[PDB]
Amino acid sequence: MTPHINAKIGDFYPQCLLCGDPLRVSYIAKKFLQDAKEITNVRNMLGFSGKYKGRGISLMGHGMGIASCTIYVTELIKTYQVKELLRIGTCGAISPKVGLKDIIMATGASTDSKTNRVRFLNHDLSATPDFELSLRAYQTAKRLGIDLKVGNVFSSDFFYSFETHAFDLMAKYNHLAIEMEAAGLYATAMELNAKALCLCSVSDHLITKESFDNMIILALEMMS
Amino acid sequence: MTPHINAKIGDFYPQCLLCGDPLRVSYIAKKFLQDAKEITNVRNMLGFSGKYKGRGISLMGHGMGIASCTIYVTELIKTYQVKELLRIGTCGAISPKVGLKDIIMATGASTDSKTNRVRFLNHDLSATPDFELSLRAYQTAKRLGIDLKVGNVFSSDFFYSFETHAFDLMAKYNHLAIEMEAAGLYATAMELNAKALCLCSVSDHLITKEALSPKERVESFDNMIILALEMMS
Amino acid sequence: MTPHINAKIGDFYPQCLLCGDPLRVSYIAKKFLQDAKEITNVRNMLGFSGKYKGRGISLMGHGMGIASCTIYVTELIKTYQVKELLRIGTCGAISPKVGLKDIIMATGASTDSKTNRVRFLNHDLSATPDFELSLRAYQTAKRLGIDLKVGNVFSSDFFYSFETHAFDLMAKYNHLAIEMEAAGLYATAMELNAKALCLCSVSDHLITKEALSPKERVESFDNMIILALEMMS
Amino acid sequence: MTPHINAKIGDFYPQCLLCGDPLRVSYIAKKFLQDAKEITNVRNMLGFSGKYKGRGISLMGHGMGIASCTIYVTELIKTYQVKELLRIGTCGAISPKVGLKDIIMATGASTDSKTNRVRFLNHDLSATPDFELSLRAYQTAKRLGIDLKVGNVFSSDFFYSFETHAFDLMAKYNHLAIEMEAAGLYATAMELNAKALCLCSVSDHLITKEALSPKERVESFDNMIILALEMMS
Amino acid sequence: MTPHINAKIGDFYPQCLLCGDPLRVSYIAKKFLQDAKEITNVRNMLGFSGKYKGRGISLMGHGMGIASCTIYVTELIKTYQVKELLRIGTCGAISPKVGLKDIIMATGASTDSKTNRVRFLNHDLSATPDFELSLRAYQTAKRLGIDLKVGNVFSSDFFYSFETHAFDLMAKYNHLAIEMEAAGLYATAMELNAKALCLCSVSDHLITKEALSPKERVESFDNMIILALEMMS
Amino acid sequence: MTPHINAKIGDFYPQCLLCGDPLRVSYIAKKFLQDAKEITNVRNMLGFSGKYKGRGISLMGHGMGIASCTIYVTELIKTYQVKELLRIGTCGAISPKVGLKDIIMATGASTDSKTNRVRFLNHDLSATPDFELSLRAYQTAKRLGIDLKVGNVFSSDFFYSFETHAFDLMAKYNHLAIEMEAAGLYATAMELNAKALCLCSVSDHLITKEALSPKERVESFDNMIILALEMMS
Ligand SMILES: Nc1ncnc2c([C@@H]3O[C@H](CO)[C@@H](O)[C@H]3O)n[nH]c12
Ligand SMILES: Nc1ncnc2c([C@@H]3O[C@H](CO)[C@@H](O)[C@H]3O)n[nH]c12
Ligand SMILES: Nc1ncnc2c([C@@H]3O[C@H](CO)[C@@H](O)[C@H]3O)n[nH]c12
Ligand SMILES: Nc1ncnc2c([C@@H]3O[C@H](CO)[C@@H](O)[C@H]3O)n[nH]c12
Numbered sequence A: 001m002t003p004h005i006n007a008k009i010g011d012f013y014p015q016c017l018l019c020g021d022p023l024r025v026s027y028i029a030k031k032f033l034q035d036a037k038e039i040t041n042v043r044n045m046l047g048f049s050g051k052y053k054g055r056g057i058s059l060m061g062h063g064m065g066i067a068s069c070t071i072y073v074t075e076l077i078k079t080y081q082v083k084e085l086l087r088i089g090t091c092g093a094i095s096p097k098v099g100l101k102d103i104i105m106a107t108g109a110s111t112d113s114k115t116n117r118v119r120f121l122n123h124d125l126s127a128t129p130d131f132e133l134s135l136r137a138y139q140t141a142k143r144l145g146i147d148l149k150v151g152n153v154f155s156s157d158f159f160y161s162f163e164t165h166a167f168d169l170m171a172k173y174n175h176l177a178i179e180m181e182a183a184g185l186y187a188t189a190m191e192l193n194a195k196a197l198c199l200c201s202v203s204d205h206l207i208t209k210e211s212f213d214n215m216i217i218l219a220l221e222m223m224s
Numbered sequence B, C, D, E, F: 001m002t003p004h005i006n007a008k009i010g011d012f013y014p015q016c017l018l019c020g021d022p023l024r025v026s027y028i029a030k031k032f033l034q035d036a037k038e039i040t041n042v043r044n045m046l047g048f049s050g051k052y053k054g055r056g057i058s059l060m061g062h063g064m065g066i067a068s069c070t071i072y073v074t075e076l077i078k079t080y081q082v083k084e085l086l087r088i089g090t091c092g093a094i095s096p097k098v099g100l101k102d103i104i105m106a107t108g109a110s111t112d113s114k115t116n117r118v119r120f121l122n123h124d125l126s127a128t129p130d131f132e133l134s135l136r137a138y139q140t141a142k143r144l145g146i147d148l149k150v151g152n153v154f155s156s157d158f159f160y161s162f163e164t165h166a167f168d169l170m171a172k173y174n175h176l177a178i179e180m181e182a183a184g185l186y187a188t189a190m191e192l193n194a195k196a197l198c199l200c201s202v203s204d205h206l207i208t209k210e211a212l213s214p215k216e217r218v219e220s221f222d223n224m225i226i227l228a229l230e231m232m233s
């Protein structure tokens, strides 16, 4: 076990969905999985294992911020042998190319964190997902009739930003939304030779100021 | 209200104890507070309001890491008018001068985060607590008989460090332990003109190599909890 | 009629193949492009327009290094109205998952350059290609039987590196090879709302030191050239 | 015997007051010490030993700027076995919470220097004083009826700043004044396991534009001096 | 022999004139050299050897940008035994001290590149030419009657800058013009213990927006070419 | 008139010799200057005005480190209208090209300071002297038979370095010795459009550990002193 997860070794399936909110994790388990079982609950951060169309899938909460997400993903990969990690979170849109409830696939995750400079020789790590997973998401979305928005996200250490004047420039450079974990998810899976992908649903639009079941079904179907 | 707290304005007393683990927040509520009332629970991050020896105090969980801690502390100060914030967390020791279950008062919080450079002109912000709260901690601990170790902590973005070779250097510069929130709590309270202090109890020793169970991280630290409650009385 | 291109507006088709070496650009025009016409030649950096399976395609040399690549790509987009930019080049392998003659599709381009920090608020810009273009490359490679390797590249300001001790760490973080332009092409295309993708053929293995002979170098690369022309038509 | 101090080993008491200005060091020796003795004079940077109310105490100049301070402090600790170093300097106020001639105790020293990143892994070192000395100063100030302001200072490489637009942000983050050595004093004493503290009296008010004269910066701060001598007794 | 130069070892003279544009290299070979042989042409990047008024000298193109220039200079020094490198080229004026057609000798080259921090301990490398070459340029221009402006240049990674708002500041600090290679040339010559100098001629004024005609760009730089060739004699 | 200089306006000649040690400044006034007159003494930092071979010449102490040197140089130029600043001093050699008693002319000054990044858009400022002054020194040294060594120096914030393992790399990049002010003097003179040059005499070798005796130090420094005074005539 670990300081942060109290599941037995082997309780996690090799494919795992991730959200920051452990209550969204619990919602998915109850609504979409058969024979769901809570397997961890340290710090109220819940994880579950269960079945979707007969196939095992795990769920795990990772909290908020790159440092929190990195703890849980590192342990899922190294201790619990998880191979495929699909984050399904929320984000604040900053681009006119997306609207409320749109699903974004993050093909790159920029950041204001120092974590990847520490990891990567003080240079610029382009934090990216596994390509096969990104291709799988695109094809799965197509057969579900979901319109996938695709681009970069900006993973910030700040929910309440001190650089809101720079949102336009981020959007100019194909950043569709801001969240707070993807660059850490991506860098950790790169570090540990695992397959990761971030999808986020737009819950706020930061420019225009304006029930993610479709993203959940997308994630479950691409793990089938 | 706020995106991460569903208490209404006025639910928090202006003095608030803080832990990363909302279950520790839950444990302190049930055991030490009379008429404890759960006042927030978004994302399972629990907060409480209750009285301690007749004086009202609040409790709030802040999650793990500077980014998580900053969200909750910002919201407590700006929206819930919390005035004094006392973090009582855990940490990993990197100094021979401390052992398991020792209490550390962080008079400075160094960091490998970029957050304070972003806040502070790309310069070095020396993240520090409110001196009056630190003096209270020292005096209260003296009165209670608690041996308070005082020094810097290092607030890291990494629980699993890529720089374990640097631990002796950190300890040479008076860093007693590593945790992951103090520099953010301190900078946020500095930004927002509030009073903050970080106390942390040693749950791991990174040199003599020990570690405490997740249960033990809630249960073996009543000394630090009582010290915090007494400071706020 | 930019400082570095003397074509007229309208001489470039909206899809353009890019190489650092203008002589390779010339090779492609003479071997593959019907009705190939030279349209620019400032600094001996040649560009061409022609047709491949009935579709208009342009070709342009960009020289070596992010700064050189950035000049040409900026001018192609902002003056000559190029919308899709497909770069093919060579690279030096640093990963045990790729070998000589492999074709790599760069789904991200890390860098030791300061250019993207200058462009992007002194933060970390994750320099990435257009997804629909990468989709086309994968689908076309499968169709042509090419076993496309997919991962990051590291775009360096140094051909002769001062950090060869870091190659294993780059390879651990899914960098398959080093070249010197992709981070620049990707960031310029992101800035200017254009669709770009980089493919590179492994001519040299920086770890084992194996290297293609000149005849091998042109034996392969022809496949990469066909891939690029096929995905653009 | 160092390049910068020509005292003999054993001339310094373990407790030493420090000023940047050696003529203030001279002023203190002549006015407040019995049996005072000039023990060093290299580069006109004077130091003295003598008694204050029967008790031995040393005084030493450290010049202006972190690099100068670090030289003298390093030598006082490593060569002359000084254990307690109390700086009593001057500063320029940037916060409305203080005025001319107020005394400030620096519970942290932010900086625009690169020295602490060089010392400390290119991370953020929170340069802080020894807590027991800081406790000593608060208690003695109270005991003497001296009003003592407490907060951070910002130690800059610049007397003539290029970032005066940033002073309000500094003041917002609890920086009461700007001086040029405390960060280096603090980090050197952390490096070398010594006890250090910085007090500074406001000699310039950067928001209203007052500036005392050179004569005045030596003679107008007797309360800070008496405070320092008292906490060393 | 080298990946980017296909001359035989010994084909270059120890003194080599450098220019970014290989067609300008060819122009110099035609108008100023006798018995000139083109000795290298990889990537259309021409180099020559021949006689300037009876004295053997070489010419070599280096492309655009620090990374491109560093490749060619490194190969000239380490493989082809070049000892004195004189670089000429154009620049964009940012100071009121220079105007169109002025020749600038760069006694320092500042930069927005990360390359010298990678080279030099992440500190500030002051990239400078060989002094004897600068003195020889100064005496040769005086003798030839050529007015030589002397100061710093700024070597940018960006031909199309994102920091045009900063040009006045660069000019205040004695940056007369912007180009894209000198900082790399100087750092490379310093690494490899070779002598190097950069002259540049103002073809464009980035402030007043004046520019030379197409004819003038062909014909106005002969005085700089002659100065270079003469100081190699 | 300034917080650090109590000279009357007009007390300084427009040509000023600088040295960090005010007692060395006094020594120069006392031995070489006709009608030498003390004009400032704030903080025991002496300065003088007088005549050498009939021409008026000022001397000024600037203390140790970039921050201190910047204070005095800024005030000399801005308040006292000093136009030409000739800095002498000592240095610690790190290159095998120089030995004890050698006089070094610094045509560039690298640094580990953050000052020039703060000054210069967070980019790399190449700190360089005025070229005319460098020629004057070379020509005067020639006339006087002095074998003047020319290259870069490294201006460090640290007398007691934490990076001694890097000295060989510094010397590789043509850094002949280490001192602590030149990068600041140069940047300040660039900022304020003044003419400055740094000369330093090798008193110690940090590689071979040779050192000049306390006596033989003063006879080696008269040569550099006379070089400086002869340049200002
Ligand atoms: N402006 C923003 N708007 C909506 N959601 C987010 C988020 C995401 O939601 C969480 C913050 O509520 C956090 O984990 C992050 O992934 N970050 N920033 C946001
Ligand atoms: N060796 C250790 N290293 C880093 N952080 C912690 C902590 C603290 O406990 C949590 C991480 O387990 C988080 O709240 C952090 O601040 N305890 N032990 C730690
Ligand atoms: N070790 C290496 N091996 C093969 N090719 C390259 C390249 C590519 O080839 C060019 C340098 O020869 C340049 O344009 C870059 O894209 N960089 N580094 C390389
Ligand atoms: N407005 C001001 N700004 C910066 N430093 C100082 C100082 C201090 O006084 C000296 C500079 O005058 C030096 O010791 C510095 O720490 N006094 N007033 C200052």
Ligand SMILES: Nc1ncnc2c([C@@H]3O[C@H](CO)[C@@H](O)[C@H]3O)n[nH]c12
Residues within 6 Å of the ligand: C003, E020, E063, E064, E065, E089, E090, E091, E092, E093, E159, E178, E179, E180, E181, E203, E204, E206
């Ligand atoms: N604004 C500018 N104006 C004129 N020349 C240049 C240059 C020089 O000309 C080349 C770009 O055209 C480049 O390699 C450099 O040598 N850079 N920036 C310039």
Ligand SMILES: Nc1ncnc2c([C@@H]3O[C@H](CO)[C@@H](O)[C@H]3O)n[nH]c12
Residues within 6 Å of the ligand: D003, F020, F063, F064, F065, F089, F090, F091, F092, F093, F159, F178, F179, F180, F181, F203, F204, F206
């Ligand atoms: N290793 C070293 N050796 C000799 N001199 C110096 C110096 C020079 O001498 C002073 C240090 O005593 C300082 O101000 C600088 O000018 N810095 N570092 C030195």
